Design a protein around this nucleic acid. Structure first.
Ligand SMILES: Nc1ccn([C@@H]2O[C@H](COP(=O)(O)CP(=O)(O)OP(=O)(O)O)[C@@H](O)[C@H]2O)c(=O)n1
Ligand SMILES: [Mg+2]
Ligand SMILES: [Mg+2]
Ligand SMILES: [Mg+2]
Ligand SMILES: [Mg+2]
Ligand SMILES: [Zn+2]
Ligand SMILES: [Zn+2]
Lengths: 1367, 267, 49
DNA sequence: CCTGCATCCGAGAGTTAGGGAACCCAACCATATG
DNA sequence: CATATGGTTGGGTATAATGGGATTGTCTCGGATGCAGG
């Protein structure tokens, strides 16, 4: 069966034990002599499977045919060895351990369920404090103890055992009290000892004993090595012993009858306890805990009166009950698990539901948050106690290998060391438990075991990470394996290394066609090797595939016919070329390979811009699509000749550049001469004679008979283009002279070069009328004109003819650029004379500003600002002077022509080459006071060079450090939009958006028509939502807006007939997990309605991300709010320079004091006030009108405030406009559709304000579609609908909040996503692209779309046969 | 909160030390409790280990987790003996308590000894825990009648436990204790012959310096078996992107060429 | 600096040897283990970035 | 009792390429050889 | 199937010893949270 869903859930100890094929009991990996796995070790074949195929460990069963045979002598099943990478093991922990994912991921699941803080949970889990599970009527400090109370070790012990204190006694100092007498607090027990607690005092090691004799006394000294046997105040008999000693001769036998007393105690032990003498056998022994009214001794004559612990001292025949209790307080994962098992989820859920009626908002939020976890557990069926580990699963050995390197050394994974530590600590804990060790040692060992489990699951999370001795490197845990840029998801699932691939340096391929690439012969032989083997077998080069492979292995064994076989192999096939970084989809393209000599890939010049490729060492990768489907996709969809327009803007992307533009511009420019300079002639004969005499230039603009013309237009009149070009070939005229030629039935005053360009386009397109319509004959051919020509040719004729035209333009541009004579010399950087004047005037004015400083009229800031402004205007004037000199005196200068044609260069660089370098910035960010007055032709001084180095370094650092924020943004957008596909023809909606055509003035003067480019980017290709009547032209509903329609609408707007356009947009589409054909519009790369199945989300993300990588605030030139603002806009960030907006409508009243300023908005109902700093700038004036959602100051609007005030559509408009402003500022063209898709994903969720009669909770965030469906169901049954408000969240938070746990886990915050999904038991339905890529499936887009992938094809004969069979 | 070394040190420091009188008393009580328990075992006829376990379980209390049925039945039977015998049971209880108190008070010597074995393949806490095991052994076997201080007999057992743990658990591939000692002797001898010779000795020198039964081939094999495995996750290069295991090919699974050859051969 | 680190390790080894041995029969050769110094030098000259 | 306000902690930060320290003594299962 | 050898493993040493070793040049952002005021 096909896999359709993947579910993730918590694992029970029973489930883990059912997974395991056996328990790993020993930390041994392999034997040190034989290199075989040790029994019950981390590599045991009995648990994980045999190392060799169908062969047990001892060799009893060494063949197949015995599947499922468990060796009697070894215990190794007979099966494939590959099972060593699938079969798991387990470790049985002596004590339970907590899974760190559910402890340290804030907020903690265990803490949230049991209402324990993080500090309290940490204290209990790591054996720092106790938690009470049964008070047993205990009292602490006068207050009874309750469940879930934390006791310190001192409080716990004091309550569990009681109070005692030992006071030492120096030798020679006696005790004022007797052994076994009550002592109150403060009762002095010695001349320098004062007690603190009440209870009985007990002598410890009395130094001397007084024994009377029936009377007279005697003394006996007691050394530390000897004890006293007779109790205090007891008579002794002759022959009895008193002071037992190590030596029989040292024993003290009483000589006669006498009483005994003990004096000089070494120490005094004061305890709070009760005393009960007995005279016979006792009932309770030492270490027993008793209650009031329990039998102690004497058959029940004496009875206990208090709760406590019993010690039966036989020396004094007395039972002592120390006041204690039977409290049941525990620490660690055992206690936590006990709390987890006792939890009843339904009752807790009811308590939280009642808690949700409190007027407090914070308390309500806490109850809702706790309820989230409770309900997730209740619905999923997971038991909470499963969050505490008892059986630790063990990864199969082949995924934690211990392999021998070629040199015989061994390499192993860190997981083996982590497992070894865990097993060692578990075994030592078990050994210590079996030995009855004291509780301090056991507590230490249990803490160590918990830390070992934590390190195994997630190392480097709590405390110092575990490292291998002799190194500072943390060991790599499972969490490290899963997550990160080097983790499993991003490194092995969303991207892989592939076969049938190669890489090499690229070289320009000017003779190639648009669909061809030059591939090296050796690379092609290696890439198509199996096909070559099959073809060689087909022919007679080799008898069989093996011999063919052996032949192709050795270079000297290769012959001539194998190359012909290879040429036959690749016929018609295509390869994929790819250059990193792949910023957009045109970074991968399909080409037909032509086999070449050498080791360089040959690239067509027209695809270099799309690849962002050049020839100073760039390398490209080659991939081979294998199957018929892959080849068909590459040849039809990703062929270079089929991708001529940008998917982001709709503008041509394969177009003339560099040398081609230069050549076409050179041949399409006309000469201008000043020899005649507008002279007067009555008759043309006079002009001709003057020119022959030498007074008038050939192309000088003279006036004859009252009309402007030139001697060239009268002297040279050609019957047809062939005659003009023949005259050019004979040196009569040049291509740049203006003559008169009869073409297309008209007499044109044009140059032969422009006629030649017309002939080139006409012969390329094989149609004279359309070609004549497409070209602009009376202008020089530059970048923009050629782009317009290519686009118009595409629209009017098709990509095939467009590709032919592009190739013809490339060929002729190169040909004419070669012979033009374009070169750069040092004199070509012409220095204008005016610059000198401009400099002296400044050296004059500067002195004046200094005088302005010698009389006190100017401050530091004023003088600095004025100097800076002076130098800025001087730089601007010098730029203008340079370009005016170029235009007037040297109209054919190489730098000028290069910049003017759009081939290379901008005015600032020419100004630096010719005029002056300008002002420079200090590393602190402030400008210097002296500018660089030298250009690059004159040469800089040492100081100026060093001064400019600061800006050069700053630009380099900026580039290197920012490119990663742009890449990050692109990744975030791919993850938030990857699921959006075109899924149907029409969603049926009647909603739309209104594209505006005018904008408010910066001084609020009036409305100004928007720029043509912005209107084009917002209107081109869209579907009209409503019928439009403009300029006597009817645009029907459902009409895709072409460029001509956009131009017509702009012209109508300029006549006041229309102010806005209603169109469909993705912002208002109702298709689930995607859009529809009408709400998307035109496929911008094809200028035709988008096909169903297109992954428009990926295209949108790429289109937004590509320009920011390079063109945002590419190499920076140090010569006299870009990406950050876009990232801030896409993340719904609140601005730090936030402005103030008018929440309501009203009139403005400015209230000004000398110390404070405020603005009152006075409505008819209410009047609110806004206090702002005095230094601020106000966009409003006293007595003005402002609407709801309007700003009152300059700055950025907070999107969340706008959402609260004005609503969803206003926020969508603001986001789109503000994102587009940044891109327009840099000159990047990008249609609004992509940003609209991303914003639609941003505005996806809602928050429940009133649940009504639903199971939802107030404040519960959920998808707007789910709540709409739920409300529809509610209405159908007839209950109270849920009340909700829309939410706005950034791209990161929207992407992490998706329904699919696989994509969210592979994006970011892997541990949190996985823990939440496991708690909830989420099922991934595999809707988007990331999930299907991870599972290695067919993505539901393109040829994998359900709309197209079930198509069948048949020929007529089979169809008629089937029809007859049906009949 | 963190740094478990500080927590363990504080918990050991919360127990006061012992004087000679307390130490000798505790040793006497443990010894007489062992004698009393063997006397009970002889009287009742049961296994001494089982009565030791039930006495220890009843002392440790309910707090510490043979099931409660057998412990209760045998305890009640033990609480049935006539007089002059149950006294032994009481002495056994006091002796077990003395054993616990002795270990609890002498834990600090374990830390003091174990603090000088760091940097040998075992963490600080592991060395302390093995020293605690050795201390338990020394306490159990200690004989006070010789008038010697406890620490003198405890140090030897603590060192033995630490050394055995280091020999057992320090290496990923376990090498037997005698072979580990052989490797250590090889290293010491080579180091001394390096210092003496003013250069690294050749294998013949070490073989000659070990004694009879050692040749250069055996020395080479011993150094080869003493090699420790390297990590598959060893970082290669300065950037955090290349691991050692990225450069190791899989030699187990058959290649596509090999599988195709076998299939065609089968055909 | 690396030599100083190795020398400090050597000094620690010297102290441990002094305490663990016998004050009566002790020589400079027995007290000094030069392995840490060589190891530090090798690490610096083979593993330092 | 509510609220806001610093405060703390945790998770991010572009692609491709290439690169690499005790010693001893005695019992006991395992494996080898016939 | 029957031993005989090395390899492996468990047990032992008795003046007295009693709390360890590193810490250091980012930057922002968002949620959790304890503390202050009213
Ligand atoms: N860290 C880096 C450094 C470079 N790159 C890529 O390599 C190119 C080198 O261009 P370059 O710096 O030579 C300028 P070029 O694009 O040729 O522009 P120009 O003709 O207008 O002067 C960049 O444009 C990126 O595509 C990268 O991905 N990451
Ligand atoms: Mg370039
Ligand atoms: Mg380049
Ligand atoms: Mg003429
Ligand atoms: Mg890399
Ligand atoms: Zn077998
Ligand atoms: Zn739609």
């Amino acid at each position: 069966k096909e896999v359709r869903k993947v579910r993730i859930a918590l694992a029970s100890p029973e489930k883990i034990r059912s997974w395991s094929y056996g328990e790993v009991e020993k930390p041994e990996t392999i034997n040190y002599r034989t290199l075989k796995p040790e029994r019950d070790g981390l590599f045991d074949e009995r648990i994980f499977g045999p190392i060799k195929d169908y062969e047990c460990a001892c060799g009893k069963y060494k063949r197949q045919r015995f599947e499922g045979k468990v060796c009697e002598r070894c215990g190794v099943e007979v099966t494939k060895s590959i099972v060593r990478r699938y079969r798991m093991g387990h470790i049985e922990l002596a004590t339970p351990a907590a899974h760190i994912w559910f402890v340290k991921d804030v907020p903690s699941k265990i803490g949230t369920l049991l209402d324990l803080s993080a500090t309290e949970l940490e204290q209990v889990l790591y054996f720092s404090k106790y938690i009470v599970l049964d008070p047993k009527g205990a009292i602490l400090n006068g207050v009874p103890v309750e469940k879930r109370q934390l006791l310190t070790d001192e409080e716990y012990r004091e309550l569990r055992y009681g109070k005692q204190e030992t006071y030492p006694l120096p030798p020679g100092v006696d005790a004022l009290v007797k052994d076994g007498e009550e002592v109150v607090k403060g009762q002095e027990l010695a001349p320098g000892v004062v007690s603190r607690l009440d209870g009985v005092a007990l002598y410890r090691f009395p130094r001397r004993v007084r024994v009377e004799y029936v009377t007279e006394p005697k003394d006996y000294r007691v050394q530390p090595h000897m004890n006293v046997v007779v109790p205090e105040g007891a008579r002794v008999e002759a022959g009895d012993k008193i002071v037992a000693a190590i030596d029989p001769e040292e024993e003290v036998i009483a000589e006669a009858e006498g009483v005994v007393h003990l004096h000089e105690p070494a120490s005094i032990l004061v305890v709070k306890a009760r005393v009960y003498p007995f005279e016979d056998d006792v009932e309770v022994s030492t270490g027993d805990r008793v209650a009031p009214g329990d039998v102690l001794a004497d058959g029940g004559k004496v009875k206990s009166d208090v709760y406590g612990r019993v010690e039966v001292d036989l020396v004094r025949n007395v039972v002592r009950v120390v006041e204690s209790y039977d409290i049941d307080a525990r620490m660690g994962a055992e206690a936590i698990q006990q709390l987890l098992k006792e939890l009843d989820l339904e009752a807790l859920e009811k308590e939280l539901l009642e808690e949700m009626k409190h007027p407090s908002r914070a308390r309500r939020a806490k109850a809702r948050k706790r309820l989230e976890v409770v309900r997730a557990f209740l619905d999923s069926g997971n038991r909470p106690e499963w969050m505490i580990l008892e059986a630790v699963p063990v990864l199969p050995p082949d995924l934690r290998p211990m392999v021998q390197v070629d040199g015989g050394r061994f390499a192993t994974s860190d997981l083996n060391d982590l497992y070894r530590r865990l097993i060692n600590r578990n075994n030592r804990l078990k050994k210590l438990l079996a030995q009855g060790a004291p509780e301090i040692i056991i507590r230490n060992e249990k803490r160590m075991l918990q830390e070992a489990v934590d390190a195994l699951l997630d190392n480097g999370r709590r405390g110092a990470p575990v490292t291998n001795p002799g190194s500072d490197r943390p060991l790599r845990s499972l969490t490290d394996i899963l997550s990160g840029k080097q983790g499993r998801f991003r490194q092995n699932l969303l991207g892989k290394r592939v076969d049938y691939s190669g890489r090499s340096v690229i070289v320009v391929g000017p003779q190639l066609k648009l669909h061809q690439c030059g591939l090296p012969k050796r690379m092609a032989l290696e890439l198509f090797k199996p096909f070559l083997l099959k073809k060689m077998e087909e022919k007679g080069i080799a008898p069989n595939v093996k011999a063919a492979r052996r032949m192709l292995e050795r270079q000297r064994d290769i012959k001539d016919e194998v190359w012909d076989a290879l040429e036959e192999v690749i016929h018609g096939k295509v390869v994929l070329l790819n250059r990193a970084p792949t910023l957009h989809r045109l970074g991968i393209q399909a080409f037909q390979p032509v086999l070449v000599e050498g080791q360089s890939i040959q690239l067509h010049p027209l695809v270099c811009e799309a690849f962002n490729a050049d020839f100073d060492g760039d390398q490209m990768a080659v991939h081979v699509p294998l199957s018929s489907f892959a080849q068909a996709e590459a040849r039809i969809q990703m062929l270079s000749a089929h991708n001529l327009l940008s998917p982001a803007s709709g503008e041509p992307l394969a177009k003339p550049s560099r040398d081609i533009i230069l050549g076409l511009y050179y041949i399409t420019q006309v000469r201008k001469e000043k020899k005649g300079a507008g002279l007067e002639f009555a008759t043309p004969e006079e002009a001709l004679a003057a020119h022959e005499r030498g007074e008038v230039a050939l192309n000088a603009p003279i006036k004859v008979a009252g009309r402007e013309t030139s001697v060239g237009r009268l002297k040279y009149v050609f019957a047809n283009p062939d005659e003009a070009l023949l005259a050019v070939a004979h040196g009569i005229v040049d291509l740049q002279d203006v003559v008169t030629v009869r073409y297309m039935g008209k007499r044109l005053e044009t140059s032969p070069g422009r006629i030649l360009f017309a002939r080139i386009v006409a012969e390329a397109v094989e149609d004279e009328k359309v070609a004549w319509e497409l070209i602009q004959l009376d202008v020089p051919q530059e970048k923009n004109s050629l782009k317009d020509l290519v686009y118009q040719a595409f629209l009017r004729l098709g990509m095939e003819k467009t590709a032919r035209l592009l190739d013809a333009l490339k060929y002729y541009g190169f040909t004419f650029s070669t012979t033009s004579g374009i070169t750069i010399g040092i004199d070509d950087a012409v220095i204008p004379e005016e610059k000198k004047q401009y400099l002296e005037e400044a050296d004059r004015k500067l002195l004046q500003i200094e005088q302005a400083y010698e009389m006190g009229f100017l401050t530091d800031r004023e003088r600095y600002d004025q100097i800076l402004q002076l130098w800025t205007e001087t730089t601007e004037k010098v730029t203008q002077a340079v370009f005016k000199n170029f235009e007037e005196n040297y109209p054919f200068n190489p730098l000028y022509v290069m910049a003017q044609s759009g081939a290379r260069g901008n005015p600032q660089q020419i100004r630096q080459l010719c005029g002056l370098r300008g002002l420079m910035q200090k590393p602190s960010g402030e400008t210097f006071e002296v500018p660089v007055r030298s250009s690059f032709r004159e040469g800089l001084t040492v100081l100026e060079y060093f001064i400019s180095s600061h800006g050069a370094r700053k630009g380099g650092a900026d580039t290197a450090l920012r490119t990663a924020d742009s890449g990050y943004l692109t990744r975030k957008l791919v993850d938030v939009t990857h699921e959006i596909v075109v899924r149907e023809a029409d969603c049926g909606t009647t909603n739309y958006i209104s594209v505006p055509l005018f904008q408010p003035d910066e001084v609020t003067r009036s409305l100004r028509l928007r720029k043509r480019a912005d209107i084009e980017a917002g209107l081109y290709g869209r579907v009209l939502a409503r019928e439009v009547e403009v300029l006597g032209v009817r645009l029907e509903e459902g009409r895709y807006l072409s460029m001509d329609d956009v131009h017509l609408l702009i012209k109508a707007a300029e006549a006041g007939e229309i102010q806005e356009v209603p169109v469909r947009s993705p912002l208002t589409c109702q298709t689930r997990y995607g859009v529809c054909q009408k709400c998307y519009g035109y496929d911008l790369s094809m200028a035709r309605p988008v096909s169903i199945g297109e992954a428009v989300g990926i295209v949108a993300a790429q289109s937004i991300g590509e320009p920011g990588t390079q063109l945002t605030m590419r190499t920076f030139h140090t010569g006299g709010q870009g990406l950050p603002r876009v990232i801030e806009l896409f993340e719904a960030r609140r601005p730090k320079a936030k402005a103030v907006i008018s929440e309501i409508d009203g009139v403005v009243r400015i209230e000004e004091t000398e110390e404070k300023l405020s603005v009152f908005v006075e409505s008819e109902g209410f009047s609110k006030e806004y206090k702002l700093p005095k230094e601020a700038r106000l966009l409003v004036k006293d007595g003005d009108y402002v609407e709801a959602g309007q700003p009152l100051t300059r700055g950025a609007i907070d999107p969340h405030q706008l959402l609260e005030a004005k609503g969803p559509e206003a926020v969508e408009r603001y986001l789109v406009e503000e994102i587009q402003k940044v891109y327009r500022a840099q000159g990047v063209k990008l249609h609004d559709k992509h940003i609209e898709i991303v914003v639609r994903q941003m505005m996806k969720y809602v928050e429940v304000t009133d649940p009504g009669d639903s199971r939802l909770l107030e404040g519960q965030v959920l998808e707007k579609w789910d709540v709409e469906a739920l409300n529809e169901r509610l209405i159908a049954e007839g209950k109270t609908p849920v009340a909700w408000k829309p939410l706005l969240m950034g791209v990161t938070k929207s992407a992490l909040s998706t329904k699919s746990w696989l994509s969210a886990a592979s994006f970011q915050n892997t541990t949190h996503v996985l823990t939440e999904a496991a708690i909830a038991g989420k099922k991934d339905e595999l809707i988007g692209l990331k999930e299907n890529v991870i599972l290695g499936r067919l993505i539901p887009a393109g040829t994998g779309s359900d709309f197209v992938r079930f198509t069948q094809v048949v020929d007529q004969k089979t169809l008629k046969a089937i029809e007859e069979a049906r009949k | 909160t963190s740094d478990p070394v500080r927590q363990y040190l504080h918990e050991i420091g919360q127990v006061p030390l012992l004087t000679l009188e307390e130490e000798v008393e505790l040793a006497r009580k443990v010894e007489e409790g062992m004698e009393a328990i063997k006397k009970l075992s002889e009287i009742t006829g049961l296994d001494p280990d089982l009565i030791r376990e039930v006495v220890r379980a009843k002392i440790l209390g309910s707090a510490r987790v043979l099931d409660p049925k057998t412990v209760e039945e045998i305890d009640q039977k033990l609480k049935s003996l006539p007089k002059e015998h149950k006294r032994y049971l009481h002495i056994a209880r006091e002796g077990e308590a003395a054993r616990q108190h002795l270990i609890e008070a002498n834990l600090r010597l374990v830390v003091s000894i174990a603090k000088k074995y760091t940097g040998r393949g075992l963490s600080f806490l592991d060395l302390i825990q093995e020293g605690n095991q050795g201390l338990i052994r020394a306490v159990e076997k200690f004989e006070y009648k010789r008038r010697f201080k406890f620490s003198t007999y405890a140090t030897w057992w603590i060192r033995q436990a630490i050394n055995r743990a280091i020999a057992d658990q320090a290496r990923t591939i376990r090498i037997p204790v005698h072979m580990v000692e052989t490797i250590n002797k090889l290293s010491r001898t080579a180091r001394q012959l390096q210092q003496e010779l003013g250069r690294e000795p050749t294998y013949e020198e070490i073989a000659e310096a070990m004694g009879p039964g050692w040749d250069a081939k055996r020395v080479e094999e011993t150094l080869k078996i003493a090699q420790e495995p390297v990590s598959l996750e060893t970082p290669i290069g300065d950037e955090k992107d290349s691991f050692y295991g990225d450069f190791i090919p899989d030699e187990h699974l058959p290649s596509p060429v090999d599988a195709a050859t076998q299939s065609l051969l089968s055909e | 600096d690396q030599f100083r680190v190795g020398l400090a390790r050597l000094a620690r080894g010297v102290r441990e040897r002094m305490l663990m041995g016998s004050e009566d029969s002790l020589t400079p050769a027995k007290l000094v283990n030069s392995r840490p110094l060589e190891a530090a030098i090798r690490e610096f000259f083979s593993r330092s970035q």
